Amino acid sequence: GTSNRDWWPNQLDLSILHRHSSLSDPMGKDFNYAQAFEKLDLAAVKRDLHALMTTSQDWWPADFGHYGGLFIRMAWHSAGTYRTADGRGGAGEGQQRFAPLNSWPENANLDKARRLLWPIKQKYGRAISWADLLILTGNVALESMGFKTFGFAGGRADTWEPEDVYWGSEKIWLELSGGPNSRYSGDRQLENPLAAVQMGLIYVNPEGPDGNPDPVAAARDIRDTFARMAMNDEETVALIAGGHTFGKTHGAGPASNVGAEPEAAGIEAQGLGWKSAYRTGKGADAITSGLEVTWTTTPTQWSHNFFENLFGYEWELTKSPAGAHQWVAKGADAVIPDAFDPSKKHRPTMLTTDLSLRFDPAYEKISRRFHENPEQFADAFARAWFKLTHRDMGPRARYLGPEVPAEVLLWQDPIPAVDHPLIDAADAAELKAKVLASGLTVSQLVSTAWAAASTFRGSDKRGGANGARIRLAPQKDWEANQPEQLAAVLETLEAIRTAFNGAQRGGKQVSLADLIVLAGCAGVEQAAKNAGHAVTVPFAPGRADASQEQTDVESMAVLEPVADGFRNYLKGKYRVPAEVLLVDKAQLLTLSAPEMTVLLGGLRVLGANVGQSRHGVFTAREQALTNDFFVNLLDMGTEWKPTAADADVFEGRDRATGELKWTGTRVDLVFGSHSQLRALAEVYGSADAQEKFVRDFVAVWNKVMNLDRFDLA
Amino acid sequence: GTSNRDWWPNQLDLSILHRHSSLSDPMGKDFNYAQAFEKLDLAAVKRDLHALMTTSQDWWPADFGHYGGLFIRMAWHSAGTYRTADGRGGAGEGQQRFAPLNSWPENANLDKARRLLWPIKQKYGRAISWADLLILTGNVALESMGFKTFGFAGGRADTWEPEDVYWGSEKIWLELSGGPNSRYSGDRQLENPLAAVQMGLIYVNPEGPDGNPDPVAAARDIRDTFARMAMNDEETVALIAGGHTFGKTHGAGPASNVGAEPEAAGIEAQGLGWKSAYRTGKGADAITSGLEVTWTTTPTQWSHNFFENLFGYEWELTKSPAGAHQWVAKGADAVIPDAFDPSKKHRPTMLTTDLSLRFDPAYEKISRRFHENPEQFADAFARAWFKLTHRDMGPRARYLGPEVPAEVLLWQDPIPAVDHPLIDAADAAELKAKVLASGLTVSQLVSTAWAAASTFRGSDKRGGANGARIRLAPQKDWEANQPEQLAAVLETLEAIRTAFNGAQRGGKQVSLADLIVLAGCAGVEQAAKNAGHAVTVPFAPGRADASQEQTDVESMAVLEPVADGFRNYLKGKYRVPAEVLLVDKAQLLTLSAPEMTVLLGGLRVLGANVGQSRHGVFTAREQALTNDFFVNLLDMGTEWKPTAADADVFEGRDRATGELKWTGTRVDLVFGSHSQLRALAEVYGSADAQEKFVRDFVAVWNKVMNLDRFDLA
Ligand code: HEM
Ligand code: HEM
Ligand code: NA
Ligand code: NA
């Protein structure tokens, strides 16, 4: 059945902006998951999960009579797809249950684990999401096996279709690096935004880099991938040794016995996959990864036996029954229990990637410290586990239920509690007029607010104007934010705020975060008035000002907008065309294509471009809010050609006279080229549309201003 | 970027049910196109279109000084993608402006035609859709050139993304038959639902079948394709000779001069394509098809010269300047004017496909008759043009504006005007009670109403319960409708109706069409009561009963549901898997995935399966409206396997004992296999979902009952 993707494979795909519509959602339009969750008897869910842990089902018998290890792996894979570069992946949307993640090789037999949870999901229904349940099950597995977690927050609403994520360009599952779609270049440099070493892996290859069983080299990949998931060395060691305190791997026979992954299996498999022809295909005969390693003498109980074994033996390279490289303890007794036969025991074994924790010099120090101080190991693992499973959930205001930890952590980008009365409508109007009487222009006001609010990304719910982090390092020094200009605008706004705040009674004050946004709204109102329209831009107060000490400078780095088509900005030259990067940014901002289109057209004519570039500024009334961008873009009396100096800049000349009328980038002209975007541009570029343009612009502006306002949900 | 389509190319694509969401739509949720159109100054639009006709632009100069021919082609391509098999394609959604149709080879340079219309589209804005505009421009071109049209209706609302249409499986533009994805098998048998001979053509190849210039063979393709677009021999001859009374083809130089189609062109092309390196690239040097034919001595005026030339000369095979086969009049003078140079004249020429009209025996008689009786030709062409351009618009109630013809035509599947008082809520309650006291079962009531209503398709807005066409030929004889049983149910309903009607005052009566639907609603209410719920099903009266004479038995044939997954019915063995056919049917019914899911689960347990088949009937309380389908489907205590005798039937057995619990088809089990569908099934199969199931079912039932109710829109 031949499609548009087949005919025109490099044409821009707008469908990623139109997912998660009300059409695909089986819940009412009014369904509020937070409110369903807040009535969940969470204690009763955990008791059921507790019982499930030791209630073996014959279709996937429990190793050692306890599902704990399997469910921990389940919950770590749900969290483990996360990338700090774009915030995509992680546990927060329950995506492990949809394609492609449900069928990745490294997710093999997690289909069994999810199926085991259906009876409990079915019992509690909409009051607990799959997304929350996966994580909660991992916590309960840990608890049942004697490990006290740091806490748990609910709130991850389920989604109903696959997320659109760039996982890599390889066409072969698990392809070794150096192929025609190599995710590596230079000195083993992993391309952004990826955070895994091969297509269909979580982080690294457990045999070692491209299957080469060198723990030292494996450690480099571990450190790189984990850094790309926002985890440092201490956290990494704690997670890997923590996880591999429990359970086992499965490689009881050759991998060629394993059939089709879930998305490729027959209909009769009812959503399960990796059906195995090896002996019983399950339990004692299970094959998952191809490795056959059991790390500890008590795989169903928390202990410090991972590090006792790691350091207490010397290790020899060997092969599993499926031919995978793995390691066995030299001269050891048979001390490790068998998963099904009480009369058999086995020698201690390890993965190459476990040995990384001893043979990398920086990890070795952390590992020794954790070996000598198992209470520090426990505490670090608890904290890292919470971070792992919550890193993509967003501000603490989204956190639900009775196990939310009270400690505020730096990676949460925390925002102080508001401790005073808020400005009211009359105050907002007074502040807007003061902003406009200061002499700040429409362009300055719009640009600064855009810069502050457009750091949000819906992928992990980080960023936005709350916190006023634009005044702090590193945001205040980002090139896209024009640091010298930004500093002068911030200083003027701070004087207005100090004057407003000094005049108040009863403790009422306004935050800089709120005033930045409100100043932007005044800019947009003034632009509308300059075009002859009377509109009020909505504004919701309640943002607070975060401190530098509450702002991790390194974790903020990934929010830098190295491409921002809405300001016609690109920091350098990329492999990816700028229009694709625009659509990527729009998706992170949660915008539809009509939203993206309105917002861009408006921003152009308001002067929001970085460096005051005239590219795409298709108006003779700059700083008035009109649909001139569209009217001019769609004017057939202009002919467009790439410049001689730069193929990515275009000159628009009068077709009759040859006179230069405009310049534009790829991001500008895509709205006149792409057949779906041009259809949208046409709507806003019609003679009846100026009022619609203004109203839709103001709505989308307000939307962007409020993206991080989970205090108002 | 590797996608789910790349990994699992045969997996079912649900995104077709979630297109055209409010997300991709730039108009408000409340935008009503009918109301915008009803305030259009239609007269003013036509005047501007009249002016456009002779206002030549230098970037695509007008042949003979008049764009009429180009615009007629543009309108006839807009209409000409239509397929009677599924109702997809046609002019009614303005899809010519989107991929792929904007870039089909046979639509070359229609991008120029559409761009010529932008200023008028821009001036009238949302009050005239592109879809309406394309057709209206065709009409105006005809009128400008002396041809009186039969009429015009507005109301085709614009769409905002590509429609999901199976156009064929070929991976090469214009691929000749017999390839690895041949749309032909057997004795030149074109696969349903296709209605074109090669990928990227409208109907046939103008050079002849697979490029072989045999007019008699070409005629067979013409007859087959046009029948597949709902046109008979008289209509076909009138359209082809009518259209080719105007304008000319373009093949001034080799086709290798012509560059990328619009979707492949550079961004600076601003949505246009097929840029040509031959001489000026345009006007006198234009290359569109590669053929160079001008049919008449007055290409910009209606005449009877097509048939004078066809019959008045003998024809010789020659080649255009691009190498294409075409025909030239033997021994003729140079009587045909040049499009740009007053000092040149040309011999009459014809396409192979024009000669079909003379050399096919059945067409020849029609052609002679039109030659001898030019008034009959004019009238038939006017009618056929109206049909061509309105065949996919639906019932007359959707027709807008002041040029709607008053004559009622058979292909509009007309329904008589209601001329009596309608039943009220008290009458509805009394009729429902009588239906239930008659002894008709839930299963009969539900099945008959489903059968009546589910012939609707949103592609061309044909079908539905209005008209009570289920009681007429051919619907009453379709195997899916179970003729024996249907006749028994209809006879009982007719007695109820006769008794109700005979008791009324003041002319009040109920139609059979209304009573069928109402009786279905009573069945659903009864089913709900059998499950312990108190449910009133909404009902809107106002359907009327069509006669057999108003119901064309051949055009109804395409509405036969040879696959209806909602009744677990498949008429024979098809190359397309049954779950794909289910999704196809859901798309035609305008159902989202959640709607399809709820609806099918409900229908299964209410006894709507054809032949009383137990496949998918996963309940022990048949004819009670419960979510049993889902709860039993998702039961992991059951293992499923295909049967020995039939790979498309599955047996579900107890995993512990091996006892047979259920059987199901592919359509049943796909809800437990496909990861997105299973996610939906889980919602309805949860412990908290019984009430939600019942209420969502009733909503979707009502939706289906009302699909064709454009009298209420
Ligand atoms: C370098 C990082 C990691 C690698 C390469 C890795 C690799 C693997 C492999 C290949 C398996 C065996 C799958 C099977 O055959 O059943 C597995 C099992 C497991 N891993 Fe990891 N792992 C890593 C990090 C983690 C982390 C961060 C956690 C949790 C905090 C975790 C917890 C587990 C658990 C609990 C199992 C046991 C599954 C069972 O009992 O069925 N691992 N690991
Ligand atoms: C067997 C069916 C038909 C075939 C194979 C066919 C083929 C074509 C071809 C190849 C062209 C030349 C394209 C170009 O080079 O510019 C063309 C032109 C045209 N056809 Fe058809 N045609 C068909 C039916 C129709 C019908 C039903 C209509 C309208 C009622 C129509 C009206 C036109 C007109 C007006 C033009 C001239 C365009 C211009 O002047 O620019 N044709 N036809
Ligand atoms: Na994410
Ligand atoms: Na259609």
Put simply, whether A102 touches B (Cβ < 8 Å) is yes
Protein residue closest via CA to atom 6 of ligand 2:
B206
Question: How many other C-beta atoms can be found within 10 angstroms of the C-beta atom of residue B346?
Answer: 18
Q: How far is B1 from chain A (nearest CA, A)?
A: 5
Query: Is A11 in contact with B263 (Cβ distance < 8 A)?
Result: yes
- The residue of chain B nearest to residue A183, with distances taken between CA atoms, is B1
Helix extents (H) in B197-272: 215-227, 233-243
């013409």: which residue's tokens? B222
Contacts of A512 (CB under 8 A, 6+ apart): A468, A471, A490, A493, A494, A497, A545
Burial of B375 (0-12, 13-18, 19+ CB in 10 A): exposed
Q: Looking at CA atoms only, how far is residue B87 from chain A in angstroms?
A: 18
Residues 125-184 of B with CB under 8 A from A: 125-127, 160-162, 166-171, 181
Q: Which residues of B are annotated as a binding site?
A: 244
Are residues A282 and A61 in contact, defined by beta-carbon separation less than 8 angstroms?
A: yes
Q: Calculate how close chain B gets to A263, using CA atoms only, in Å.
A: 7
Residue B534 CA: distances (Å) to CA of A324, B439, B524, B707: 62, 20, 11, 25
| B263 contacts A594? CB cut-off 8 A | no
Domain B565-688 is in which class? mainly alpha
| HEC profile of A370-393 | HHHCHHHHHHHHHHHHHHHHHCCC
Q: Do A4 and B100 touch (CB under 8 A)?
A: yes
Q: Which of B702, B708, B709 is nearest to B599 (CA)?
A: B702
- Asked if the C-beta of B5 comes within 8 angstroms of chain A's C-beta atoms, the answer is yes
Nearest to A245 by CA among A257, A237, A253, A233: A237
Give the separation between CA B286 and CA B249, rounded to whole angstroms: 9
Confirm or reject contact between B23 and chain A (CB < 8 A).
yes
- CATH architecture designation of domain B168-372: Orthogonal Bundle (1.10)
Annotated binding-site residues of B for heme b read 244
- Cα–Cα dist A43/A201, whole Å: 34
Contacts 24+ apart (CB under 8 A), B196-199: B196/B167, B196/B168, B196/B225, B197/B221, B197/B225, B198/B170, B198/B174, B199/A2, B199/B167, B199/B168, B199/B170, B199/B172, B199/B173, B199/B174, B199/B175
Cβ–Cβ under 8 Å, residues B382 and B148: yes
Query: Chain-centre distance of CA A55, in angstroms?
Result: 35
Domain B408-564+689-713, CATH among 3.40.50.10470, 3.30.565.10, 3.40.190.10, 1.10.520.10? 1.10.520.10
Output the residue whose Cα is nearest ligand 1's atom 41: A70
The beta-carbon neighbor of A122 closest among B5, B124, B686 is: B686
Whether B247 contacts B292, CB under 8 Å: no
Q: Which of B313, B316, B295 is nearest to B305 (CA)?
A: B295
A121 touches chain B (CB under 8 A): yes
User: Which residue(s) pair with A287 in the sheet?
Assistant: A251
CA distance A376 to chain B (A): 41
Phi–psi pair at A533, nearest 5 degrees = -110, 145
- One-letter amino acid at A536 equals T
Query: Which tokens go with B253?
Result: 């130089």
Dihedral angle computed from the Cα positions of residues B629, B633, B637 and B638, in that order, rounded to the nearest 10 degrees: 120
Cβ contact B312:B296 at 8 Å:
no
Pocket of ligand 2 (CB under 6 A): B 63, 69-70, 72-73, 76, 203-204, 206, 222, 239-240, 242-244, 246-250, 288-289, 291, 353
| Closest listed ligand to the CA of B291 | 2
Region at B631 (left for phi over 0; alpha for psi -120 to 50; beta for the rest): alpha
Q: Of the bound ligands, which one is closest to the alpha carbon of residue A231? A: 1
Give the C-alpha separation, B44 to A517, whole Å.
46
- Residues of A forming the annotated binding site? 244
Sign of CA pseudo-dihedral B611, B613, B618, B623: positive
- What is the number of helices (H) and of strands (E) in chain A? 24, 12
Which value, to the nearest 10 degrees, does the dihedral of the CA atoms of residues B2, B5, B8, B13 take? 150
Ligand 1, closest atom to CA A246? 35
Contacts of B546 (CB under 8 A, 6+ apart): B413, B414, B415, B416, B467, B468, B469, B472
Exposed, middle or buried: residue A207 (CB in 10 Å: 0-12, 13-18, 19+)? buried
Residue nearest to atom 18 of ligand 1 (CA): A249
Question: Which technique?
Answer: X-ray
Q: How far is the CA of A629 from the centre of ligand 1 (A)?
A: 53
How far is it, in rounded angstroms, from Cα A302 to Cα A144?
Answer: 9
B100 at interface of A, judged by CB pairs closer than 8 A? yes
Distances in Å between the alpha carbon of B168 and those of A202, B159, B198, B228, B440?
A: 38, 22, 9, 15, 45
Across the interface, whether the CB atoms of B592 and A98 are under 8 A apart is answered: no
Which among B77, B250, B325, B615 is annotated as catalytic? B77
For residue A500, which of A424, A416, A418 has the smallest C-alpha distance?
A424
Interatomic CA distance for residues B15 and A98, integer angstroms: 14
Q: How far apart, in whole angstroms, are the C-alpha atoms of residue B316 and residue A86?
A: 66
Cα distance between residue B514 and residue A393, in whole Å: 52
Residues from chain A that touch B642, judged by Cβ atoms under 8 A, are 266, 268
The answer to whether A639 and A661 have CB atoms below 8 angstroms apart is: no
Judged by a CB distance cut-off of 8 A, whether residue A657 touches chain B is no
Nearest to B523 by CA among B629, B452, B448: B448
Residue type at B293 in one-letter notation: V
In the structure encoding, which two tokens stand for residue A459, read together? 């992928």
H or E element: which one contains B325? Answer: strand B325-329
Point out the ligand 1 atom lying closest to the alpha carbon of residue A288.
15
Q: Do B2 and A594 touch (CB under 8 A)?
A: no
CA distance B589 to B583: 10
Query: Is beta strand A660-665 parallel, antiparallel or unpaired with respect to A649-654?
Result: antiparallel
Provide the residue ranges of all domains of chain B, joining segments of one domain with +.
1-167+373-407, 168-372, 408-564+689-713, 565-688
Nearest by CB: A2 against B6, B170, B683: B170
Rounded CA-CA distance A709/A517 in Å is 12
Asked whether A77 lines ligand 1 (CB < 6 A), one says no
Work out the minimum CA distance from B544 to partner chain A, whole angstroms. Answer: 32
A553 touches chain B (CB under 8 A): no
Helices of type H across B661-710 = 666-669, 675-684, 690-705
B-chain residue closest to A60, CA distance? B636
Q: Let me know the angle formed at the C-alpha of B95 by B92 and B98, rounded to the nearest 5 degrees.
A: 165
Does A686 lie at the interface with B, CB-CB under 8 angstroms? Answer: yes
* Helix axes A352-359 and A305-312, enclosed angle (nearest 10): 80
- Which atom in ligand 1 lies closest to the alpha carbon of residue A250? 15
Rounded to an integer, what distance in angstroms lies between the CA atom of residue B559 and that of residue B474? 10
Rg (alpha carbons) of chain A, rounded to whole number: 28
Among the listed residues A105, A294, A65, A131, the one whose alpha carbon sits nearest the alpha carbon of residue A198: A105
Report the sign of the C-alpha dihedral through residues A287, A289, A292, A294, in that order. negative
Atom of ligand 2 nearest to the CA of B291: 15
Q: Are strands A315-319 and A325-329 parallel, antiparallel or unpaired?
A: antiparallel
Is the CB of B263 less than 8 angstroms away from the CB of A8?
Answer: yes
∠ at Cα A233 (A228, A235), nearest 5°? Answer: 85
Using omega within 30 degrees of 0 as the cis cutoff, is the peptide bond preceding A374 cis? no
Reading the block at residue B178, the tokens are: 């017999």
Closest of B133, B152, B79, B68 to residue B388, by C-alpha: B79
Decide if A118 and B682 are in contact by the 8 Å CB cutoff: yes
Residue type, A30: D
Of how many residues is chain B composed?
713
Ligand 1 pocket, residue A208 CB under 6 Å: no
Q: Which of A18, A20, A66, A77 is catalytic?
A: A77
CA–centroid distance, residue B161 to ligand 4 (Å): 14
A642 at the B interface (CB within 8 A)?
A: yes
Distance CA A101, CA B565 (A): 29
Distance of alpha carbon A151 from alpha carbon A132, whole angstroms = 13
User: Beta strand A325-329 with A349-350: parallel, antiparallel or unpaired?
Assistant: antiparallel
Q: Which helix (H) or strand (E) holds B661?
A: strand B660-665
d(CA A492, CA A111): 57
Residues 227-266 of B with CB under 8 A from A: 262-266
For the purposes of burial, counting CB atoms within 10 Å of the CB of B608, is it exposed (0-12), middle (13-18) or buried (19 or more)? buried
B449 sits in which H/E element: helix B442-453
With an 8 Å Cβ cutoff, is B651 touching chain A?
A: no
Binding residues of A for heme b: 244
CB contact under 8 A, A687 and B122: yes
Measured torsion, CA atoms of residues B325, B329, B334, B338, in degrees rounded to the nearest 10 = -40
Token pair, residue B254, equals 């080799």
Q: Specify whether A420 is catalytic.
A: no
Which ligand is closest to the CA of A87, given by its number? Answer: 3
Fold of B1-167+373-407: Peroxidase; domain 1 (1.10.520)
Strands (E) across A309-405 are located at: 315-319, 325-329, 336-337, 345-346, 349-350
B603 contacts B591 by C-beta, under 8 angstroms:
no
Ligand with an atom nearest the CA of residue B163: 4
Closest CB to B23: pick one of A121, A123, A592: A592
Residue B633 Rama label (left phi>0; alpha psi -120 to 50; beta): alpha
Contact B26 A689 (CB under 8 A): no
CB A536 within 8 A of CB A525: yes
Residue A288 beta carbon below 6 angstroms from any ligand 1 atom: yes
Domains A1-167+373-407 and A408-564+689-713 share a fold: yes
- Using CA atoms, how far apart are residues A393 and A79, in angstroms rounded to an integer? 11
d(CA A74, CA B22): 36
In this structure, what are the phi and psi dihedrals at residue B663, rounded to the nearest 5 degrees? -125, 160
Q: Which residues of B touch A167 (CB under 8 A)?
A: 2
What is the C-alpha to C-alpha distance for residues A515 and A529, in angstroms, rounded to an integer? 20
Please, are residues A351 and A291 in contact by the beta-carbon 8 Å criterion? yes
